[PDB]
Design a protein around this ligand. Structure first.
Ligand SMILES: *[C@@H]1O[C@H](CO)[C@@H](O)[C@H](O)[C@H]1NC(C)=O
Ligand SMILES: *[C@@H]1O[C@H](CO)[C@@H](O)[C@H](O)[C@H]1NC(C)=O
Ligand SMILES: [Zn+2]
Lengths: 4, 226
């Protein structure tokens, strides 16, 4: 999960 | 925005471009949207030491008369925002002054929805984020149409919660929101339903958006006290  | 198309200049007057200053590194950026003349809604993970907002922009490298660069005086992150789970990825920014209403700048009413948006519905999101995994942020505002998915489609995101978030982006397509697009609104039927929050570093859809309806009361609370 990568914060955008 | 991956697999999107450049918007007609100023066709999304509520879009805010955020330049975020952190302490130990170069500046970061995110999207967001004007909900009140002096309030911008965005993602909590976009918080920093200070933030400057640019309204009225299309190509963010070339300044024009439509630009309004506003100072943010206070950042209201959700008190329950969790960095590890990315839950409650929502933040309100209070602007120094109220923006001017022009053909390029305007507010997006944090709505009134009779019923929740059903999966299968096509919505759209815009941003100045990266247009590819190794590609840089876009100079111009890009927009893409994405399909609202059933929560099962996002099961692989172990902390995804159907009640708090939206699953957006057909896995059979490449189109998706990506890094830098955070804080941008997801509009379905002309109403904001979510906020770009997170996804996979390899950009494979779907992505997870914050479900706005769920935070409507907290948003009101903050607005009423400031
Ligand atoms: C954005 O503006 C710059 C000038 O500052 C120009 O060189 C560039 O080609 C423009 N990009 C687009 C996509 O219009
Ligand atoms: C974030 O959530 C995890 C559980 O997923 C919890 O263990 C942790 O303490 C939380 N962190 C904060 C700062 O609340
Ligand atoms: Zn000031």
């Amino acid at each position: 999960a990568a914060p955008f | 925005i991956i697999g999107g198309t450049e918007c007609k200049p100023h066709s999304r007057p509520y879009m805010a471009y955020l330049e975020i200053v952190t302490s130990n590194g170069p500046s970061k950026f995110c999207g967001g949207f004007l909900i009140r003349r002096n309030f911008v809604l965005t993602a909590a993970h976009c918080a920093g030491r200070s933030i400057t907002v640019t309204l009225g922009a299309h190509n963010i490298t070339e300044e024009e008369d439509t630009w309004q660069k506003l100072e943010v005086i206070k950042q209201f992150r959700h008190p329950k925002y969790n960095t590890s789970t990315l839950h409650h990825d929502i933040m309100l920014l209070k602007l120094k002054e109220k923006a001017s209403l022009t053909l390029a700048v305007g507010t997006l009413p944090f709505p009134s929805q009779k019923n929740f948006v059903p999966p299968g519905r096509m919505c759209r999101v815009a941003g100045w984020g990266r247009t590819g995994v190794l590609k840089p942020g876009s100079d111009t505002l890009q927009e893409v149409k994405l399909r609202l998915m059933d929560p099962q489609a996002c099961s692989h995101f172990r902390d995804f919660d159907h009640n708090l978030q939206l699953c957006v982006g057909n896995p059979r397509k490449t189109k998706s929101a990506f890094k830098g697009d955070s804080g941008g609104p997801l509009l379905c039927a002309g109403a904001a339903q979510g906020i770009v929050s997170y996804g996979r570093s390899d950009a494979k859809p779907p992505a997870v958006f914050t479900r706005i309806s769920h935070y409507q009361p907290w948003i009101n609370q903050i607005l009423q006290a400031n």
